[PDB]
PDB file of C-alpha atoms and ligand atoms in Angstrom:
ATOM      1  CA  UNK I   1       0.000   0.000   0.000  1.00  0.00           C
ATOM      2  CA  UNK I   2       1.741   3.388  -1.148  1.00  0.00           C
ATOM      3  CA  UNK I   3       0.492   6.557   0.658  1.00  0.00           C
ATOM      4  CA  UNK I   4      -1.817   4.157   3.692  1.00  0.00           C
ATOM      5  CA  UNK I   5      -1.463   4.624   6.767  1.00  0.00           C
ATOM      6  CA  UNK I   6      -1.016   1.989  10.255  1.00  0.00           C
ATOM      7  CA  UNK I   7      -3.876   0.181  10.571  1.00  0.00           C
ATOM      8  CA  UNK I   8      -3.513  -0.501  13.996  1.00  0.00           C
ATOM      9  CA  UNK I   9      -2.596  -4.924  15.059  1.00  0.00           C
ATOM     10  CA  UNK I  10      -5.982  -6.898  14.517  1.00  0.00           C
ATOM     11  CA  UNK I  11      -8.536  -4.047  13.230  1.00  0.00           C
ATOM     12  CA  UNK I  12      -8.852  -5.769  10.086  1.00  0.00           C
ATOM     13  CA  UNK I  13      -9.607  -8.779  11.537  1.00  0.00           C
ATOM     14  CA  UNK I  14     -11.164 -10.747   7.891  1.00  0.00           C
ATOM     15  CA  UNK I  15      -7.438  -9.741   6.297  1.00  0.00           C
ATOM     16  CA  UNK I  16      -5.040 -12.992   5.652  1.00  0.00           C
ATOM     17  CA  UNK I  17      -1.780 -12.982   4.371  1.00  0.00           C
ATOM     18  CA  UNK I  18      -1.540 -16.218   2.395  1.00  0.00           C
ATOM     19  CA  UNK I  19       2.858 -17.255   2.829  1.00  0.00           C
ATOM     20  CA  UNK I  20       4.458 -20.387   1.391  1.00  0.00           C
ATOM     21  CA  UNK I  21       8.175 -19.056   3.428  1.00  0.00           C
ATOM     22  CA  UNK I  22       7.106 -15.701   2.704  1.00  0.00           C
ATOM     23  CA  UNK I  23       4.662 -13.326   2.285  1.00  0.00           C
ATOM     24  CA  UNK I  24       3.150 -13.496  -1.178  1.00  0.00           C
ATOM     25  CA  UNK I  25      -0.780 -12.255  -0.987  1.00  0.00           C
ATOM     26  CA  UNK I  26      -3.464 -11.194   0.713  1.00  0.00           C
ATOM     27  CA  UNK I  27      -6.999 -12.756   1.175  1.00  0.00           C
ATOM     28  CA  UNK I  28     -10.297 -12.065   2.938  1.00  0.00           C
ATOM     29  CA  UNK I  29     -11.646 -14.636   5.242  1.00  0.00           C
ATOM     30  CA  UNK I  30     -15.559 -14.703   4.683  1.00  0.00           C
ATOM     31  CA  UNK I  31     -16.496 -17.799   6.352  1.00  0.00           C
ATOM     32  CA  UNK I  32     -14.394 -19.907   9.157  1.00  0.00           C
ATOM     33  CA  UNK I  33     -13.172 -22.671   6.442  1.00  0.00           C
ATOM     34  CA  UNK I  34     -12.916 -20.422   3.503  1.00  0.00           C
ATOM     35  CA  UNK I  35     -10.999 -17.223   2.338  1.00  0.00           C
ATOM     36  CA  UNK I  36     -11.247 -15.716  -1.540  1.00  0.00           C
ATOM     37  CA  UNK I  37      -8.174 -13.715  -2.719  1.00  0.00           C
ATOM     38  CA  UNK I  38      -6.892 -13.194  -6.828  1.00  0.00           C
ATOM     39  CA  UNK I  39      -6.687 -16.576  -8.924  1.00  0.00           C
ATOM     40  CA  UNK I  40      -3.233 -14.863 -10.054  1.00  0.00           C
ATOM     41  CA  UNK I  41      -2.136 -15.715  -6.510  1.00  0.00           C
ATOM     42  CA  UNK I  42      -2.811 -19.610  -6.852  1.00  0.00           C
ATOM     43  CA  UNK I  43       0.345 -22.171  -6.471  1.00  0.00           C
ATOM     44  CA  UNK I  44       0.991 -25.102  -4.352  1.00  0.00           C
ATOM     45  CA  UNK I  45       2.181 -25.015  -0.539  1.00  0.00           C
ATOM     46  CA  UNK I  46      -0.035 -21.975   0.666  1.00  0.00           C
ATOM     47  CA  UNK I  47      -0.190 -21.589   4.781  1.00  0.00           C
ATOM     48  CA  UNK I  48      -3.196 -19.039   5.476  1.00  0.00           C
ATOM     49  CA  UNK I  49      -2.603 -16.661   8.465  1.00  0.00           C
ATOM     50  CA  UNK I  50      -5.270 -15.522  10.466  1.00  0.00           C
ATOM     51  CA  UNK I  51      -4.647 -12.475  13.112  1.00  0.00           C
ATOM     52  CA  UNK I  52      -1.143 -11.307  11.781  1.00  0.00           C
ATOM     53  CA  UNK I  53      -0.325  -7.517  12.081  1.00  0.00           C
ATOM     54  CA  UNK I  54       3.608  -7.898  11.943  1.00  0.00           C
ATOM     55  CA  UNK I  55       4.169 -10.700   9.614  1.00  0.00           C
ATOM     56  CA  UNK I  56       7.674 -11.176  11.058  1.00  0.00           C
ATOM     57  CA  UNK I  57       7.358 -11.596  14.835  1.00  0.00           C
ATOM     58  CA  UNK I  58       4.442 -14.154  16.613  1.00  0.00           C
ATOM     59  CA  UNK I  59       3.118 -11.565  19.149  1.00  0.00           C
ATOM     60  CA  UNK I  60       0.186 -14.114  20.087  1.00  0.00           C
ATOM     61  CA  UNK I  61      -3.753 -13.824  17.891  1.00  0.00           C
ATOM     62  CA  UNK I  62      -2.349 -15.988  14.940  1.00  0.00           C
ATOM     63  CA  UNK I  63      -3.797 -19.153  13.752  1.00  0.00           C
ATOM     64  CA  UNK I  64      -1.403 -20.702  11.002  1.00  0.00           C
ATOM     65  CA  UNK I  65      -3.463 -22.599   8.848  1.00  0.00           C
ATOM     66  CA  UNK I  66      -3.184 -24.941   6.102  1.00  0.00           C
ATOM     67  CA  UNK I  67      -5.178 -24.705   2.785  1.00  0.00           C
ATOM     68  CA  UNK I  68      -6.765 -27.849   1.701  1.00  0.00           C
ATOM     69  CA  UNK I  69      -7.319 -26.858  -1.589  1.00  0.00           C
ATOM     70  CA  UNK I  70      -7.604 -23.853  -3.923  1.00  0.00           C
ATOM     71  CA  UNK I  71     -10.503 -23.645  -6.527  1.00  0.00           C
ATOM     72  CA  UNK I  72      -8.993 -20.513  -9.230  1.00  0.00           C
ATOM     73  CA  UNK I  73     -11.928 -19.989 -11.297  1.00  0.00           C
ATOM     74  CA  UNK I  74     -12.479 -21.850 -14.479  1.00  0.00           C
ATOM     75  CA  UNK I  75     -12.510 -19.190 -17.156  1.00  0.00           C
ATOM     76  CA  UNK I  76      -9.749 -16.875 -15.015  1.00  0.00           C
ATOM     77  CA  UNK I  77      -7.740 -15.289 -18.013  1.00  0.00           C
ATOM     78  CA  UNK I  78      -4.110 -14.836 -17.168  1.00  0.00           C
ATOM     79  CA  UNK I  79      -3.538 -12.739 -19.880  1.00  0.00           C
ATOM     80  CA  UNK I  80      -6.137 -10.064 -19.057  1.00  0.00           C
ATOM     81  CA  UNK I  81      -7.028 -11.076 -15.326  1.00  0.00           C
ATOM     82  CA  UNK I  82     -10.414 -11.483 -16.087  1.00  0.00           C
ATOM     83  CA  UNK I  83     -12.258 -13.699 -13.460  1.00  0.00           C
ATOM     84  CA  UNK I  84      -9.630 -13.060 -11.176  1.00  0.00           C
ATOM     85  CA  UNK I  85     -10.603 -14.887  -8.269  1.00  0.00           C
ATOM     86  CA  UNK I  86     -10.016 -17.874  -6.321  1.00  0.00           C
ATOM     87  CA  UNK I  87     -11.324 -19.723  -3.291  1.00  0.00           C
ATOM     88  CA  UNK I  88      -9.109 -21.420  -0.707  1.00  0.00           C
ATOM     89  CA  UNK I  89     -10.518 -24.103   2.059  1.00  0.00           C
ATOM     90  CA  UNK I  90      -8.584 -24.328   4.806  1.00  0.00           C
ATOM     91  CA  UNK I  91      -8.032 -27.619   6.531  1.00  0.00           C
ATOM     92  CA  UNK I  92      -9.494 -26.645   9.786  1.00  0.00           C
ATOM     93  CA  UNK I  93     -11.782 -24.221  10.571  1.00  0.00           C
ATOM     94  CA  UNK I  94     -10.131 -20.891  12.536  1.00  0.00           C
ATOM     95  CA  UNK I  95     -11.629 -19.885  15.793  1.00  0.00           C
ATOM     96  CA  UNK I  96     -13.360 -16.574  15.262  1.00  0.00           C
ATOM     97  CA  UNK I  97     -13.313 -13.623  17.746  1.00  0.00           C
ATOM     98  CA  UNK I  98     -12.562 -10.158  17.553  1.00  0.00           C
ATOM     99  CA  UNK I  99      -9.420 -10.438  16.366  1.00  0.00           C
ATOM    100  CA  UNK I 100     -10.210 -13.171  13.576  1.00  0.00           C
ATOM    101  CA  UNK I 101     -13.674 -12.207  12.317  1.00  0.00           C
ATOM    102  CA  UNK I 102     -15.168 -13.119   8.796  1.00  0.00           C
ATOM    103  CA  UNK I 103     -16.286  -9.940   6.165  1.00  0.00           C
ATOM    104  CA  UNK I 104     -19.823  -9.942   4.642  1.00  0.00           C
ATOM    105  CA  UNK I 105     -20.059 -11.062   0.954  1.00  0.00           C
ATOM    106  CA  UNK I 106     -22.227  -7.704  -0.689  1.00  0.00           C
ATOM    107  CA  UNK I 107     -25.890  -8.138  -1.770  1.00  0.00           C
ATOM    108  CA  UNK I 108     -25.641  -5.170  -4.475  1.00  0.00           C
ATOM    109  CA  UNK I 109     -22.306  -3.564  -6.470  1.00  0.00           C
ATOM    110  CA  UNK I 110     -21.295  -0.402  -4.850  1.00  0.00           C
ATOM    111  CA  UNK I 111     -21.196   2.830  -7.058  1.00  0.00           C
ATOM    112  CA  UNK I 112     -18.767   5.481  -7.980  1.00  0.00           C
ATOM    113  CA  UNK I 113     -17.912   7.352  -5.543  1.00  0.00           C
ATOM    114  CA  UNK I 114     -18.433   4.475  -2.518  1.00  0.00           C
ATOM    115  CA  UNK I 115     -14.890   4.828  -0.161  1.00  0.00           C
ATOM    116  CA  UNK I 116     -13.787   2.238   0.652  1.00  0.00           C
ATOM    117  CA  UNK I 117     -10.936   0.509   2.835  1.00  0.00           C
ATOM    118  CA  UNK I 118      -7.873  -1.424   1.198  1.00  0.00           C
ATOM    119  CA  UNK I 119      -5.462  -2.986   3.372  1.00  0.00           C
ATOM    120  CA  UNK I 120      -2.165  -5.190   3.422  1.00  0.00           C
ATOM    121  CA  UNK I 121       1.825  -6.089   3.785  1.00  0.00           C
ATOM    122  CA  UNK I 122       2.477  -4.970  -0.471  1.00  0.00           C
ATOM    123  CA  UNK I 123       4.773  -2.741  -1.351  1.00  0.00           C
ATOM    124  CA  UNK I 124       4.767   1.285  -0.168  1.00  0.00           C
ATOM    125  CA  UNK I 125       7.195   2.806  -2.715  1.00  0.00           C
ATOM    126  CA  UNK I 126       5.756   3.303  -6.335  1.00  0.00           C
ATOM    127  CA  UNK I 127       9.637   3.340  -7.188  1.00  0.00           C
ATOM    128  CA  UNK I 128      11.593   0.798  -5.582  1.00  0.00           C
ATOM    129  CA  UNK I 129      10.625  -1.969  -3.275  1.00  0.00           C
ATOM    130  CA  UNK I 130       9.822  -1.616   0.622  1.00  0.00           C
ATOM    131  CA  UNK I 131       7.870  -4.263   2.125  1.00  0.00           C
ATOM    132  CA  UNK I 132       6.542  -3.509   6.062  1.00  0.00           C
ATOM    133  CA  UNK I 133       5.892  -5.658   8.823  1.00  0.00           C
ATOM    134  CA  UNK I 134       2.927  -4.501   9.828  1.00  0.00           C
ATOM    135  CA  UNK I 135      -0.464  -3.962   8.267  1.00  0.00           C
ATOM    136  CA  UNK I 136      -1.129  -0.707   6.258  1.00  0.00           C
ATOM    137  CA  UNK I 137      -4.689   1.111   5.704  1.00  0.00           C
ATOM    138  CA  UNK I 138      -6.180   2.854   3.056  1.00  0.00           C
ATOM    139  CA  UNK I 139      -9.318   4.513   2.523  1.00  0.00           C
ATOM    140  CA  UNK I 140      -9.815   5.498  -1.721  1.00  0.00           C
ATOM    141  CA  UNK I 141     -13.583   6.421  -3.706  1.00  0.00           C
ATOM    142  CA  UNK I 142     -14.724   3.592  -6.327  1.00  0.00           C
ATOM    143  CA  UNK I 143     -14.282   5.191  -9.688  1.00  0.00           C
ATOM    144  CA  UNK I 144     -17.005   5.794 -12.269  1.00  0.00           C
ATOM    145  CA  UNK I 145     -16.547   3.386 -15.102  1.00  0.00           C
ATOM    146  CA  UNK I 146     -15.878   6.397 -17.643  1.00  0.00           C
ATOM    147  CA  UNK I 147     -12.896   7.567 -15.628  1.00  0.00           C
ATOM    148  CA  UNK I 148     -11.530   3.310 -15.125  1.00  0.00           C
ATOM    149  CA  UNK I 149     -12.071   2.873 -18.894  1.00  0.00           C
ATOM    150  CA  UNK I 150     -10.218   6.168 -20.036  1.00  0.00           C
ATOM    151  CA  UNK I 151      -7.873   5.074 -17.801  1.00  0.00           C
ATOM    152  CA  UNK I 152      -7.204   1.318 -19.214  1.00  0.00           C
ATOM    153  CA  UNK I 153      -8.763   1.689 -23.198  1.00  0.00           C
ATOM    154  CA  UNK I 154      -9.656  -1.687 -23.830  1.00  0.00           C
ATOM    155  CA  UNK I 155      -8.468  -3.696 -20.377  1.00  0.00           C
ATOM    156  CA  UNK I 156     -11.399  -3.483 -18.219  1.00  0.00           C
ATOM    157  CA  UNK I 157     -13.819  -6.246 -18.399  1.00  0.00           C
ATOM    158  CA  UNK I 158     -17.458  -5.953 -16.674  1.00  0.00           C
ATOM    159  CA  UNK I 159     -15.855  -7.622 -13.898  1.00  0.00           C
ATOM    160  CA  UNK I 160     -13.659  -5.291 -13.077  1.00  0.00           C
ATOM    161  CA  UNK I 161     -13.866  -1.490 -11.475  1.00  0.00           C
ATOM    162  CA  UNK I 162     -11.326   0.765 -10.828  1.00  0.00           C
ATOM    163  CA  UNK I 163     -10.418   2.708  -7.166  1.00  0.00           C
ATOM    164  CA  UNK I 164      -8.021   5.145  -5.938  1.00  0.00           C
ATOM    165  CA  UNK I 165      -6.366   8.831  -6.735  1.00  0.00           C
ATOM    166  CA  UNK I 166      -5.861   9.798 -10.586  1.00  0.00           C
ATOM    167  CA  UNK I 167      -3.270  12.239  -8.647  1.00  0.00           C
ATOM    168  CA  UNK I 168      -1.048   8.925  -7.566  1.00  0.00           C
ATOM    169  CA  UNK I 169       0.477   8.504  -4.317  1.00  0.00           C
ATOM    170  CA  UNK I 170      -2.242   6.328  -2.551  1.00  0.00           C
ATOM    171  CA  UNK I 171      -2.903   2.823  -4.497  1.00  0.00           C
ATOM    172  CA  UNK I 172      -2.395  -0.253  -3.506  1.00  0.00           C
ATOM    173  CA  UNK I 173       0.788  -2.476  -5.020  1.00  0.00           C
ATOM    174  CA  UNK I 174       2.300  -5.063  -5.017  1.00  0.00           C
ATOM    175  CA  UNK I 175       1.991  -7.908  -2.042  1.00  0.00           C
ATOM    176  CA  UNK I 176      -1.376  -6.751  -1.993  1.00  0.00           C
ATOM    177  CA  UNK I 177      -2.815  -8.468  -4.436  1.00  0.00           C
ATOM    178  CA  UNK I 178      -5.777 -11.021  -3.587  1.00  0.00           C
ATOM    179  CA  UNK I 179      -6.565  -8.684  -0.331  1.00  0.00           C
ATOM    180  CA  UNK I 180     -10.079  -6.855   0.601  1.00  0.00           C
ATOM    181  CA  UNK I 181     -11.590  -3.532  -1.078  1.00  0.00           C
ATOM    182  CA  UNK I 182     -14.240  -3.318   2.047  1.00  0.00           C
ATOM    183  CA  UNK I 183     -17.018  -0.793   1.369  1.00  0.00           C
ATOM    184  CA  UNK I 184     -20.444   0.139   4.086  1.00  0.00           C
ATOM    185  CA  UNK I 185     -18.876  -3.434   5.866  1.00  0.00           C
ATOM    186  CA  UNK I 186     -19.351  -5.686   2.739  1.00  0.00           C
ATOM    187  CA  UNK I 187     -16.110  -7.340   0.519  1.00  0.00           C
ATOM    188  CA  UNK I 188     -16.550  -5.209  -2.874  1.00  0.00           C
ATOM    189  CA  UNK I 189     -13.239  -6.095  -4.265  1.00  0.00           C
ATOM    190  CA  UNK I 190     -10.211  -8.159  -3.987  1.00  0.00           C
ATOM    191  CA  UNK I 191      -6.798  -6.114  -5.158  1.00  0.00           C
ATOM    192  CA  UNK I 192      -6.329  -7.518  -8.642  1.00  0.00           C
ATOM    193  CA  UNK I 193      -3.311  -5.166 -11.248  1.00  0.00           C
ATOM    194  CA  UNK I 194      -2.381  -1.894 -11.833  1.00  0.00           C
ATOM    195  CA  UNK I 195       0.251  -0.009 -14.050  1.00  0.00           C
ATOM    196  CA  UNK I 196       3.041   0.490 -11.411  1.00  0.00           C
ATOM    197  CA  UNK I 197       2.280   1.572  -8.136  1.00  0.00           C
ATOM    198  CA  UNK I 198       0.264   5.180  -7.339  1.00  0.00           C
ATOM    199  CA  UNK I 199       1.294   6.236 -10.809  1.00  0.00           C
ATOM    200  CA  UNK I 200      -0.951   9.889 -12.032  1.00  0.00           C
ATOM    201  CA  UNK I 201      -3.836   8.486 -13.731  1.00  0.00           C
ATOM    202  CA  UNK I 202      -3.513   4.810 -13.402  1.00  0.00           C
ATOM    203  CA  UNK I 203      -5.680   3.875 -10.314  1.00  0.00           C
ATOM    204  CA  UNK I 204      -5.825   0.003  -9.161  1.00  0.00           C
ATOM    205  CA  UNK I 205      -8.018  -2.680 -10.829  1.00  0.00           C
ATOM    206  CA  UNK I 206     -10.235  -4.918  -8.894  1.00  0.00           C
ATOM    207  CA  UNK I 207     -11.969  -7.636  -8.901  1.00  0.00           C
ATOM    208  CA  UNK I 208     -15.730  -6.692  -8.886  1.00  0.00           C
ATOM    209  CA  UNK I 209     -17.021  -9.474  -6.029  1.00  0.00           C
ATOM    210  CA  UNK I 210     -20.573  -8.550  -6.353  1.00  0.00           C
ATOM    211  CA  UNK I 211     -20.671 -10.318  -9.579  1.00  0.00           C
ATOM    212  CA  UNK I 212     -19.270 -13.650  -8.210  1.00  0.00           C
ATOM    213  CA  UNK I 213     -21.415 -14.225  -5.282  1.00  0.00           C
ATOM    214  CA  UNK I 214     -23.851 -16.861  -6.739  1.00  0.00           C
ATOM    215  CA  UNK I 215     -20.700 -18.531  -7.742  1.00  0.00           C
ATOM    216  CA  UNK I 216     -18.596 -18.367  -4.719  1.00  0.00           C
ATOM    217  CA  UNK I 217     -21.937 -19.615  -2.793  1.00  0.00           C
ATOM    218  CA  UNK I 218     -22.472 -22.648  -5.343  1.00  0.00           C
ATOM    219  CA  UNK I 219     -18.939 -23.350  -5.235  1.00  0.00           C
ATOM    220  CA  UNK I 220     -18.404 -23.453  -1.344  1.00  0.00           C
ATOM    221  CA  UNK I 221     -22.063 -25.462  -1.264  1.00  0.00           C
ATOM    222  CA  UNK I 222     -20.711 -28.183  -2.984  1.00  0.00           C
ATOM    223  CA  UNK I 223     -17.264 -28.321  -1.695  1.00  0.00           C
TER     224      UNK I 223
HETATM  225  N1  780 W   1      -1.313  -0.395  -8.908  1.00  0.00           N
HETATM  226  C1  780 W   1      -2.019  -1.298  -8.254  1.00  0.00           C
HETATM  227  N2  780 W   1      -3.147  -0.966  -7.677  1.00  0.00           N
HETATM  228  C2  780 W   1      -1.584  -2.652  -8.157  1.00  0.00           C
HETATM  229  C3  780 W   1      -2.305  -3.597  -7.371  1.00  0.00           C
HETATM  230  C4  780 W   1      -1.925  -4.939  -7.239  1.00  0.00           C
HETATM  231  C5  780 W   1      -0.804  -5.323  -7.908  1.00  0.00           C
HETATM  232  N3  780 W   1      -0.234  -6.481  -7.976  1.00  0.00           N
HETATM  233  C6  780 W   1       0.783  -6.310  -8.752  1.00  0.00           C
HETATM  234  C7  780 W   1       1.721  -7.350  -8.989  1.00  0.00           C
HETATM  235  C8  780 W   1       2.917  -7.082  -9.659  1.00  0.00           C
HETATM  236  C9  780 W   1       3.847  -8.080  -9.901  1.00  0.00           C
HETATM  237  C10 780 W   1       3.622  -9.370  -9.489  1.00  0.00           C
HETATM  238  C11 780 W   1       2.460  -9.728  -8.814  1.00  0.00           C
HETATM  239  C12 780 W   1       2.292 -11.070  -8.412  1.00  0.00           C
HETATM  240  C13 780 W   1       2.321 -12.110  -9.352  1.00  0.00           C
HETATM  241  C14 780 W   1       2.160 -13.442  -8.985  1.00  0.00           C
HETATM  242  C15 780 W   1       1.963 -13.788  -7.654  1.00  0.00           C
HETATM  243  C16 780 W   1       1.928 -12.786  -6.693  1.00  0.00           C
HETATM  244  C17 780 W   1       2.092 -11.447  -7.071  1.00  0.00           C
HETATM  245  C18 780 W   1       1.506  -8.701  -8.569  1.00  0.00           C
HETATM  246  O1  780 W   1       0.328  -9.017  -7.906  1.00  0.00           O
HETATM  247  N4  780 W   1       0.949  -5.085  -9.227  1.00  0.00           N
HETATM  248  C19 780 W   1      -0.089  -4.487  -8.662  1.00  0.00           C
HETATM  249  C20 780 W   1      -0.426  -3.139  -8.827  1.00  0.00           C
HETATM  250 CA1   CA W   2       2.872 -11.826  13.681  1.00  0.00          CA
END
């Protein structure tokens, strides 16, 4: 996250970081055996951590996890990230509390205009790389679809929506991909691409969740 801000240890309590020796992704746990992050995040040996703040140090809250399997979905595009979403089961359910809590799946998309709250361990320099150890915040409007599409001519599917600053400086980056967009308490996105990091007119893509919830419900249902 370039330009965020502390979040403060546990106040996100749906975020995940998904490590296989190392921090790689994000995730948002929605249910106490399943978490959805970006299908462009899938490989084999993924540990899911639950109640992490600084991913370098076990301060106590964290449940280490491992994923039973990882469903990427079946017409996920590498080439143009459409359908850029995946599904992870865990192998045992987490114990929820305050500090390990699961985020509401939406009912409706949000509009233009909705802020909403990013977080996760990515990158904070839009030149160079700096990795923290703790969580990072930020708060950045839902853009109108004109604005996303002027933006990316031609890379922007219907399942898709663009976020952020067209100044630069806040965005999200790097490390950060498969993590929540949370807007009015529901998941809305899941960090998906971007050209660079916070760059003047090239907000983040993301993953528009409201049009995968049928899916994601079927899915889990028979799983
Ligand atoms: N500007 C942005 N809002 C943004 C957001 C997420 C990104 N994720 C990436 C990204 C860049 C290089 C490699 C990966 C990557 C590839 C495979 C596995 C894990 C991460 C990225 O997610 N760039 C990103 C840029
Ligand atoms: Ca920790």
């Amino acid at each position: 996250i370039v330009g965020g801000y502390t979040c403060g240890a546990n106040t996100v309590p749906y975020q995940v970081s998904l490590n296989s020796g190392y921090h790689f992704c994000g995730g948002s746990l929605i249910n106490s055996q399943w978490v959805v992050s970006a299908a462009h995040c899938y490989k084999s040996g993924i540990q899911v951590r639950l109640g992490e703040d600084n991913i370098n140090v076990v301060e106590g809250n964290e449940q280490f996890i491992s994923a039973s399997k990882s469903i990427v979905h079946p017409s996920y595009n590498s080439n143009t990230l459409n359908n850029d979403i995946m599904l992870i089961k865990l192998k045992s359910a987490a114990s929820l509390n305050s500090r390990v809590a699961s985020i509401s799946l939406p009912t409706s998309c949000a509009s233009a205009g909705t802020q909403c709250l990013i977080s996760g361990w990515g990158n904070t320099k839009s030149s160079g790389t700096s990795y923290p150890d703790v969580l990072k915040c930020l708060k950045a409007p839902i853009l109108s679809d004109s604005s996303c599409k002027s933006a990316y001519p031609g890379q922007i599917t219907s399942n898709m929506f663009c976020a952020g600053y067209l100044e630069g400086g806040k965005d999200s980056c790097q490390g950060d991909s498969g993590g929540p967009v949370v807007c009015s308490g529901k998941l809305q996105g899941i960090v998906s691409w971007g050209s660079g990091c916070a760059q003047k007119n090239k907000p983040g893509v993301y993953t528009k969740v409201c049009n995968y919830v049928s899916w994601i419900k079927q899915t889990i249902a028979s799983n």
